[PDB]
């Protein structure tokens, strides 16, 4: 079975590309990471940094999570990311997404031993 840490990697890690993300990126990636299986997942962010760099965020700036929990951490440096946002004309099973590349600080929730990211909270 898939751990929460593995699910975070599946949903949010894309170290293989720098940012290059074509206009096609989200359409392809949302499908290939299985985020369009039961529905069109409305919003999702991929991080283009090393797993080590993202894991390191769990010992960086402690900040409040959007849900009010206290286990969120904001990266000290900006990171290359791609936001995927479902288009208005997207209809399941043919999920369509607008691909937006950016460089922003990420905020992730961390849990467990070892203490690793389990949720992507926000980018600022
Ligand atoms: O800028 C964002 N980018 C973004 O990807 N999200 C959603 C998200 C949360 N999660 C966490 O992991 C999922 C594992 O099931 C949960 O829905 C959530 O805790 N995954 N995607 C929210 C943002 F504001």
From Swiss-Prot:
The keyword Hydrolase applies. One of its GO terms (cellular component) is extracellular region. GO terms for molecular function: lyase activity; nucleic acid binding; ribonuclease A activity; RNA nuclease activity. Substrate binds at residues 7, 10, 41-45, 66, 85. Its main location: secreted. Disulfide bonds join 26-84, 40-95, 58-110, 65-72. Pancreas. It is found in: Secreted. GO terms for biological process: defense response to Gram-positive bacterium. It catalyses: an [RNA] containing cytidine + H2O = an [RNA]-3'-cytidine-3'-phosphate + a 5'-hydroxy-ribonucleotide-3'-[RNA]; an [RNA] containing uridine + H2O = an [RNA]-3'-uridine-3'-phosphate + a 5'-hydroxy-ribonucleotide-3'-[RNA]. Glycans are attached at residues 1, 7, 34, 37, 41. Its EC number is 4.6.1.18. The active site is at 12 (proton acceptor), 119 (proton donor). Belongs to the pancreatic ribonuclease family. Interacts with and forms tight 1:1 complexes with RNH1. Dimerization of two such complexes may occur. Interaction with RNH1 inhibits this protein. Monomer. Endonuclease that catalyzes the cleavage of RNA on the 3' side of pyrimidine nucleotides. Acts on single-stranded and double-stranded RNA. This is Ribonuclease pancreatic.
